[PDB]
Write a protein that binds this ligand. Structure first.
Ligand code: ASP
Ligand code: ASP
Ligand code: ASP
Ligand code: NA
Ligand code: NA
Ligand code: NA
Ligand code: NA
Ligand code: NA
Ligand code: NA
Ligand code: NA
Ligand code: NA
Ligand code: NA
Lengths: 393, 393, 393
């Protein structure tokens, strides 16, 4: 576990890069990738039940006044960590210089959709945010039945809450059983990514790869570790517990698919179920510091590859636009590169221009490698804020 | 509540009509309507769970012989109240004269679809009638397990019925919490309708508007109040309890979306859960006296605007066709005007004729204002029949 | 029951064939078929709940070591019975000679899809195999909570398992109530098939009809009865208990739709719920001996009608291809004839050839009559293997 997952990650990238330099990326896509795809299928299987069941129980166990206080805390935390990741990525884009080696030249509906019109349908087809909304309303209604003067109502409410909790506790036991297959699933996914896109990390694409990974490492040290030290949390013991969720996120490149592993990690470190069952699923789609840092670095790569000087006001409007795009990015692999296109239409750089689509295509050739570092930071920011908010209730 | 909802309804129509005469209907569509749309999203959220859970519990608590007796009673009640609404609308269409001011000239698959082939899918995508069918079969099966000679079967059946009831009782507590936002949601929806279509109530369109609302008022007095007095039910105390569901139906213009408010109203007035949990959801799609009265008035408006004399046999075939269209009309806003087109193909007036589509378009310009009075009578007829059937078990 | 279903089957085929020789097949499609379609709607209604609920309970009651042993047993049984059905059909195709009277001339994605990415969605839209996968994982997780050192976890796990079992036991009581309508539903479906396709059983099509039904009768005697005698099971008492599921399968021509009747039959004969709740739903899509025997007979009919000699190596590759097509065939009516086209592309006989499509069309004219005998053997093979595996745990 603590060694076999690291073994599969290291040995898989070695087997991936070796088989990638030869050109057998089509061979690992046939015989190796299905073992990693299966590992993701199992984790995606548990997302909707483990989110809905844990939140009905958690929103009941906690008081609505405290639950709303956690939302105000975790949202202010999410907006600040993402805004810091962009300004850290822009700084990392200027410490390095990606784009100088190549010489080219040139809402209300979303809020209302949080409220589902059919929670049975919401559970049926993904939709974590509508599920989060209905599960909170349900759990809060459950405990208002606990205070009923009627005996039949209290027994029926306790029965439903227990059955729901029985489902929740069941899903967590499945994660511990699925994570036994992680060394094989980790080995397979890291090898497929390193085989297909490991050859593409050359030259200016190797610069933007190092500019992002250094920014992500600095995001963990200068932001997450510092904030954990300020709120009195040992970072080394935190990474030891989050090691399973961080590597699973780095490997599956899906914050939504890693979500059952992160909620187990938060449970395994004693965080109240009324907090992590609400911040982790909401943070799996809103808190994306790794995506916010990646989109800030690449927007500078586009502007530098095209020989355009970005004013301080333009660098400022990039931060506000990337944070908006950081939230709109899905917790699925490759979503950040698609959302990067919307951040380029705001600075007046359309993808219809051939030189814009050229550099954008270059990023796609290494997007999955950058996607690994993105999701791990998108997920760590969810656990870091959950632990800090739970530290202050 | 008893005042704030009336305040939001009155003040909203005032703010709506004032902002409508200026032309700021696009402004209330942007800043005001989302507050009313959100109120409808919350009510639609509770429909499927509150229908399925309450009916499994209600069909278990009641005996199958009594449940089938309620169906025969409530269906005979539904067909008579709708047939009376059309003949009342045709009479109201002749007391007034809409169409003289403008001078122009010229099944088995549905029954089988009540039985769902996947109750999990039925719950996922609307389909109240298939849910009603499965919930009745489930609740009846639950109580047949209560009489099992086995102890494990009785405990497991009581466990499921309690958990289901825990969900039901939970949804009702949500309605009381959502109705706290009704004064804002009522104010928003009445203002958007009065701003967009309040300017259109001029001339012959003001005649058909008064001809319908008088017929709906007469439907409540001469039919509902009389039948409540015959079966020994004080109408004033009935309207006091149904005030929340009647105004919510008048404002949301959706019998299906108002359904969680009407089932709470029926619970708040002591009606057995084995009755209202079956008649109200079935009446939200079959009992539409307000729609049956509206389609009878408008069919005369089409024939009078085109200068065509309707024989007594034609007026008779209109009633039989509108009642058929009254049942096929959905409990969603604007469904009655779409179903009005099918009632015109039967009398030999196709919408391909330009003069037919002209008067039909005129009705669309005031359809939402008429839709408010429709749904309130469609819903009142559900509560009136439920209370009368519960008065006789 | 034991007589009325046989009465409706016999009298329905008589009324079907009589009304079919006149030509009133359109009359029985209008007034008779809806009564049979309704009977299938009710059975399809119970499939998903009775599969999911019974398997969570069954996989919990049984040990995972024994459950995996049943899978290895029932799969080896399924592959052998299907391979024997093809070799029996090819032998039956050579005892008779269909095609001499007419003189003409001329995977990994499937495995990964067993693991659902949303069990709520899987239940919503069919997908028995993903449900089987999640229900087993859930039931196994339930009993791992029974051994928890925590009291709240054991109570919540027992609560969920009971509620789920309460649903399961409920669905079985519905089957016994739906089967009371079987004599009407059986009479209707047998009459519609005999009216539409009874006229088509003439000449060479009557030969292939007798060649299949004799092979299916020999499949029950020489394979099922022999294996039941070897494992010490009285065949006469077995057919008496399976009479309801065998005739329902013969009449509805849907192994998936008959599944709630077969699981009840297996319960009514004392088979452990940890076995039949896993082998019967898995066998309703994988074990299709009647389809495997039908596709073997028809492939010879195509080759004989086109005057092509089939080598022993070709007859061998037909068996391996039909068994592959036997598994891919759905448990819905007419699926075997569609899957027969894929078995013809392997032997190098495309349906683009006019003479190939001619004989293929002839089989479609009698496909539903052959589909009756298919499903009954597809279902009997599920019960036969379940009883034999349960005989040895
Ligand atoms: N891989 C990221 C999304 C992205 O950056 O494309 C996540 O799942 O959070
Ligand atoms: N508004 C009506 C339908 C209609 O008349 O269009 C209802 O919801 O019942
Ligand atoms: N009727 C078969 C399928 C087929 O052979 O077409 C079944 O349901 O198992
Ligand atoms: Na963030
Ligand atoms: Na995230
Ligand atoms: Na995001
Ligand atoms: Na009615
Ligand atoms: Na209604
Ligand atoms: Na209707
Ligand atoms: Na088989
Ligand atoms: Na089968
Ligand atoms: Na099959």
């Amino acid at each position: 576990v603590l060694q076999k997952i690291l073994i599969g990650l290291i040995l898989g990238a070695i087997v991936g890069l070796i088989l990638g330099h030869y050109g057998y990326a089509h061979a690992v896509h046939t015989y190796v990738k299905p073992f990693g795809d299966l590992f993701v299928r199992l984790l995606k299987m548990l997302v909707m039940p483990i989110v809905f069941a844990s939140l009905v129980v958690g929103a009941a166990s906690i008081s609505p006044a405290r639950l709303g206080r956690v939302g105000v805390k975790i949202v202010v935390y999410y907006l600040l960590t993402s805004a810091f990741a962009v300004t850290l990525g822009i700084i990392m884009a200027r410490l390095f210089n990606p784009g100088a080696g190549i010489h080219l030249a040139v809402l209300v509906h979303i809020l209302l959709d949080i409220v589902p019109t059919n929670p049975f349908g919401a559970l049926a087809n993904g939709q974590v945010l509508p599920t989060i909304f209905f599960a909170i309303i349900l759990g809060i209604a459950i405990t208002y039945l606990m205070n009923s003067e009627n005996e039949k109502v209290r027994k029926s409410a306790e029965t439903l809450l227990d059955a729901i909790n029985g489902l929740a506790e069941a899903m967590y036991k499945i994660v511990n059983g699925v994570m036994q297959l992680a060394p094989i699933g980790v080995f397979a996914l890291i090898a497929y990514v390193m085989a297909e896109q490991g050859v593409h990390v050359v030259g200016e694409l190797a610069k933007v790869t190092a500019a992002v990974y250094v920014g992500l490492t600095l995001q963990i040290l200068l932001v997450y570790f510092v904030l954990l030290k300020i709120y009195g949390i040992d970072p080394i013991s935190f990474i030891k517990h989050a090691k399973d969720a961080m590597l699973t996120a780095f490997v599956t490149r899906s914050s939504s698919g890693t979500l059952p592993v992160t909620m187990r990690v938060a449970k395994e470190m004693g965080i109240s179920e009324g907090i992590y069952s609400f911040t982790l699923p909401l943070g799996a789609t809103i808190n994306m510091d790794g995506t916010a840092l990646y989109q800030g670095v690449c927007t500078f790569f586009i502007a530098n590859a095209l020989g355009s000087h970005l004013t301080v006001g333009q660098q400022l409007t990039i931060v506000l636009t990337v944070v908006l795009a950081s939230i709109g990015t899905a917790g699925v692999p490759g979503a950040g590169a698609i959302m990067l296109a919307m951040a380029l239409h705001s600075v007046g750089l359309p993808l219809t221009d051939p030189n814009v689509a050229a550099a954008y295509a270059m990023i796609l050739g290494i997007d999955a490698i950058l996607d690994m570092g993105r999701t791990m930071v998108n997920v760590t920011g969810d656990l870091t804020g959950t632990a800090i908010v739970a530290k202050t209730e």
